[PDB]
Design a protein around this ligand. Structure first.
Ligand SMILES: Cc1ncc(C[n+]2csc(CCOP(=O)(O)OP(=O)(O)O)c2C)c(N)n1
Ligand SMILES: Cc1ncc(C[n+]2csc(CCOP(=O)(O)OP(=O)(O)O)c2C)c(N)n1
Ligand SMILES: [Mn+2]
Ligand SMILES: [Mn+2]
Lengths: 556, 554
């Protein structure tokens, strides 16, 4: 009988299946072909529903939700280039861990490759990027519901990390009276409908094993490198490293309090690198290192062994040292391999890190972006959240600032895309319900400008800083050629964000000094709304301040 | 010795190569990894260079440029999600033919699957979507320049239609010696030449149909889909000669001698008279209107033919018939019309009556009336760019565009995600005064492409119809309780600040007289003007349904 109603039972089974794997959040874009999924989502009370009109944005929103909640988040799009728009976030998820569940509506087999409207080849479209790909058959009562749910349960239970693409063909008639056409079809699942378990539970844990020679390795001259990890882990890492007596190089992404701050500077001094040559083991916890100096030192250092511990699969060392690649939750790992008290071995790096910070403090007064990067700890909301954007900002904070241990930092530093930052910020705040400082460059805000539509709906204050240095000035930092520099690298767009804010009825400030920035913040934090704070600066000031400080610190 | 230099030498061969296959335009997005490619492209005065910060918009800009010039258009992006942002445009290319050449930078093989920054798996990212995909190896002088250029020449020379993915890995130092020189000079006078190194240029064509003189005396229908504007004119004369009724889509440029087909095709007396068609000849594809697609699906002529310069099946109802691959103008010459007498006498009445049913409603200030009135606004010697959702459908159903008036669109996949950047492409390509029309969500999706509309060579009027949400979901029989939140998604916004941000003239007319003025002024400078038509949310869909019914009864 009714195809429009069976379409829905079929959809209804998919969505309800996801509930049993901790999918609370679901992101939905508009369309027709997606009707069965979207109706099923709307009916399902177990969901918190988020919507957006830009499918790349929706993709990053879902990324932000998952990045924070550490749950899997579902997405629903109709067919066509809507599906293609998930690719960026999907790629990002694939590198950093977010469990993104992409339910992509499709045309049925009959309407593919025959010049039907809005009909592309969907299955296999994201190549190896998703962790699991499921390519569903034309819907039919001749396939038991037990097959449908099992297929989902398998993909969701074995998901360690990364995306899942679940392609969903539906034949038209999409709309009609909801008959009771697949009701007994669904009832073959019995009291599963009233359960909270999966239909099929398939949930192996993947974990490296206790390193049984650790007692010898922990007593060697070692260096701790802290990359991306959770707030709590950052504190754990710092106490552990200190116990061991090893120098901790901690990234902005790390939340360890960076007890040797300005590593991107001091790592530039030869006295620092001589000392580090003595290290026999490096233990890196987390990955996605930020700073240039760190990436170099890490690429050139020659310890006996190099260990990377993180809870995502695959090689994480881009310089391919002899060593170990250890899959584990970082907190469990610290516990499974406790530190033992040893007398610190580094005499000269601790003094160098203080001299480096001193040198930065000396230059804190100018109203530039490197200074803003430096001061950023003074502007973090209490009980709040920092989301840090790509390009200069993340580098500057990493180089010029010492962020507090355990203070939550968020980012897209997998593929480092400047394409999703605002919509990602939105999902980040909606996930925790926390006050949010997001900081982003001018090209970046333009790139995801329409995500300001999302930012009209936040549950706690959000402050979006837009550092506007008229272009991508990262490329003033890099030794790019002066002749095509401007039109082909910087691409200034000669724009401001007063109107952007006005369009989405968001508060706006363009502060011209430290007192006006603080006033702006003070106003901002008062309401559960987004405030745009554009900081206008001389385009090359930030990039030069870094080069100068780099050279200065390298002399000490 | 120097890697930097050889990286540049290697990229210059790639880019020079492309000069030889008709590539004039190259669109570039910013990046460091792309340095080799971008510098080589900067140097080469054979290209017009276009830039943009949004890689998805840059893809559709290219798409726009290609759509109109009918040349291949090159693209450069850096590694990472930049590349992934090209996917929507490639896919649209793959469907409708634009030749997009995607030079996408990559890190070297040593740097993949090892947690390097901005390093993803790039070869095959786009699956079956490009027509060719070259995955270049790591640059080395051990592969001679000849191999590199041959590979490109094969890909381009044999390219009938669609995108080419060229993944170009580069190891770094990225930032010049004589390193790659003698290695380049192995190409001899090819550097001062005009032609590919290897020419591989097979023609792909369907043979003349030897039974044409038999069929052309039968009861035929002619269906005109997307084609060139000149082709629209020739198809018009052709069907007119034959005495066959011409159903011409908005994209056809036929002059639609039987307009409002989406309306009159719901009249039983029209279906009845078409039920006598022994042959249907369709030229072009991507037909717009619902009723047309239904009439197609259900008709049973002895033969259904589709003529178009793209490959693959094009008939979604899968009739017994022929799929003929040809330039349409060439195909009309080859299968010339016999001056017979019109065999349809009632359809001409209904098409006339349905258009009257429309003018009886032309007065309100609504989107359905704008769609209908739209030729009064067409720039002289200009070109129309029609966006998606309601606009294309209402214009196809209620208007009569003139024969030969160039119409452009994205009706392959029908994405609402690249309409503004595509339109900018359309304008830059032809240098013509342009009218582009777009929904409110559409304008929101590609909002940042207004940066692109600050550099236009002639007046561009951008009409944003704002009915507050995707109102096509009030046309479609969607469940009323979920429709606002889960289909319609009103964003409760206007475009005044959007325009002003990018330094573009703006109007929000509240009547026909105000609109006229805005238009009249707008055409007097080489700049983009934004015109926002605010209309009651559901009036367009409502109007159209009521016109369907009305026509359906008479
Ligand atoms: C989607 C994407 N495209 C391109 C890049 C290359 N890219 C890296 S930084 C940058 C500049 C962005 O400029 P902005 O956001 O204004 O900040 P700034 O460099 O001035 O700090 C670009 C284009 C990228 N990382 N991601
Ligand atoms: C990239 C993309 N995502 C989703 C769709 C599905 N879709 C088709 S029409 C439409 C509504 C667009 O609204 P406006 O652009 O506001 O159109 P209108 O009011 O005429 O419906 C949508 C979301 C699409 N065609 N392309
Ligand atoms: Mn910038
Ligand atoms: Mn709309």
């Amino acid at each position: 009988m009714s195809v429009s109603a069976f379409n829905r039972r079929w959809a209804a089974v998919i969505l309800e299946a996801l509930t049993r794997h901790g999918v609370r959040h679901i992101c939905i874009a508009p369309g027709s072909r997606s009707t069965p999924l979207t109706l099923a989502a709307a009916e399902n009370s177990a969901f918190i529903h988020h919507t957006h009109f830009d499918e790349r944005g929706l993709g990053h929103l879902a990324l932000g939700l998952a990045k924070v909640s550490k749950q899997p988040v579902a997405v629903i799009v109709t067919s066509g280039t809507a599906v293609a728009n998930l690719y960026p976030a999907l790629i990002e998820a694939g590198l950093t861990g977010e469990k993104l569940i992409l339910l992509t509506a499709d045309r049925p087999p009959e309407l593919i490759d025959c010049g039907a409207n809005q009909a592309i080849r969907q299955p296999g479209m994201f190549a190896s990027h998703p962790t699991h790909s499921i390519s569903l058959p034309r819907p039919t009562q001749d396939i038991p519901a037990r097959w449908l749910v099992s297929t989902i349960d398998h993909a969701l239970g074995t998901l360690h990390a990364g995306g899942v693409h679940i392609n969903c063909p539906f034949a038209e008639p999409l709309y009609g009276e909801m008959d009771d056409t697949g009701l007994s079809w669904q009832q073959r699942l019995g009291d599963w409908w009233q359960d909270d378990k999966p239909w099929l539970r398939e949930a192996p844990r993947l974990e490296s094993e206790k390193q049984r020679d650790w007692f010898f390795w922990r007593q060697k001259r070692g260096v701790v490198v802290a990359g991306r990890m959770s707030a709590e882990e950052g504190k754990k890492v710092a106490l552990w490293a200190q116990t061991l007596g090893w120098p901790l190089i901690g990234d902005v992404l790390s939340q360890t309090g960076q007890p040797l701050p300005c590593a991107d500077l001091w790592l530039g001094n030869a006295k620092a690198t001589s000392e580090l040559q003595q290290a026999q083991i490096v233990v890196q916890l987390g990955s996605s290192l930020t700073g240039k100096r760190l990436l170099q030192w890490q690429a050139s250092c020659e310890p006996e062994e190099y260990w990377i511990v993180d809870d995502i699969e695959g090689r994480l060392d881009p310089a391919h040292h002899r060593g170990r690649r250890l899959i584990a939750n970082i907190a469990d790992w610290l516990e499974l391999h406790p530190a033992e008290k040893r007398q610190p071995w580094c005499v000269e790096i601790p003094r160098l890190a203080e001299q480096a910070m001193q040198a930065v403090i000396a230059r804190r007064d100018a109203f530039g972006e490197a200074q803003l990067a430096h001061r950023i700890c003074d502007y973090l909301p209490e009980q709040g959240q920092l989301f840090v954007g790509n390009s200069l900002v993340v580098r500057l904070i990493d180089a010029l600032s010492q962020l507090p241990a355990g203070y939550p930092v968020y980012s897209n530093r997998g593929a480092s895309g400047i394409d999703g930052l605002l919509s990602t910020a939105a999902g980040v705040q909606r996930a925790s319900g926390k006050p949010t400082l997001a900081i982003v460059g001018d090209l970046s805000a333009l790139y995801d400008l329409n995500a300001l539509a999302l930012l009209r709906q936040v549950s706690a204050p959000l402050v979006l800083i837009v550092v506007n240095n008229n272009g991508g000035q990262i490329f003033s930092l890099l030794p790019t050629p002066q002749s095509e520099r401007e039109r082909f690298y910087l691409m200034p767009q000669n724009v401001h964000f007063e109107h952007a804010a006005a369009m989405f009825e968001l508060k706006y400030h363009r502060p011209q000094n430290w007192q006006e920035l603080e006033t702006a913040f003070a106003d901002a934090w008062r309401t559960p709304t987004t405030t745009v704070i554009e900081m206008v600066v001389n385009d090359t000031d930030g990039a030069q301040t870094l080069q100068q400080l780099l050279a200065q610190v390298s002399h000490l």
